């Protein structure tokens, strides 16, 4: 029930405090398979899976700061986090896209080009993920918009096996209303911005469905096992 301005600031702060921006980071690169496409580069996969584990921890920290999220049953908090895991991780890595070099930057500064993202584990998802990063760029979204989009993605009453889906639908409504007033207030000259941002949630769900298929094939390909926190989210 908070006022729109209060909800926006809470969500903006939840995202900013769990997501360093590309400008804040000390970018660095690696020579590992930078110019050769391979099925799986194990050194990149080891680094990528470690950074993904860290991003999951930051995603849970973000969710716990969203108003009313911790009031849902623990079973529903878990169902929501599992279902939105890939959506939020993909939105986050795509937020750090540099188009001139066609790279994405991780939360420690590691900057990978398209071939290296392919080799790290993206595989067949690579072009869809980079296409999404390119669609996001002209929107010029800020921390409040990215945080609200992540929150709308997470607090979704249509996820399978929710105990209280109508409660989740009710919690999402104020987030959608807040994004609408914020986007219009911030940029009144662009009246089509809000529906364009909502369409990114649909694109993202399609990519995350393909991502769940990729987890299956990667499980057969990696030499060891998936890290425990990744397994909890995706299996």
């Amino acid at each position: 029930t908070p006022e729109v301005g209060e909800l926006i600031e809470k969500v903006r702060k939840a995202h900013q405090e769990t997501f360093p921006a590309l400008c804040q980071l000390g970018k660095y690169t690696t020579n590992n398979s930078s110019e050769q496409r391979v099925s799986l580069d194990i050194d990149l996969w080891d680094k990528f899976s470690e950074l993904s584990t860290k991003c999951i921890i930051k995603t849970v920290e973000f969710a716990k700061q969203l108003p009313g999220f911790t009031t849902l049953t623990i079973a529903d908090q878990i169902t929501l986090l599992k279902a939105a895991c890939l959506d939020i991780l993909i939105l986050r890595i795509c937020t750090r896209y540099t188009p001139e070099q066609d790279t994405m930057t991780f939360s420690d500064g590691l900057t990978l080009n398209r071939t290296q993202m392919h080799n790290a584990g993206f595989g067949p998802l690579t072009d869809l993920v980079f296409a999404f990063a390119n669609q996001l760029l002209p929107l010029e979204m800020d921390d409040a918009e990215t945080g609200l989009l992540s929150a709308i993605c997470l607090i979704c009453g249509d996820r399978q096996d929710l105990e209280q889906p109508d409660r989740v639908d009710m919690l999402q409504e104020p987030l959608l209303e807040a994004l609408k007033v914020y986007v219009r207030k911030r940029r009144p000259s662009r009246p089509h911005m809000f529906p364009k941002m909502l369409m990114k949630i649909t694109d993202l769900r399609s990519i995350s469905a393909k991502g769940a298929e990729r987890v299956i094939t990667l499980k057969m390909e990696i030499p060891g096992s998936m890290p425990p926190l990744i397994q909890e989210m995706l299996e």
């Binding site: 921890i57 849970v60 623990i74 908090q77 878990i78 425990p228 909890e232 989210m233």
Partner: peptide, 10 residues
Amino acid sequence: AHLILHRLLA
């Protein structure tokens, strides 16, 4: 069991 998740959430 979602052991780690339970820990992060509680």
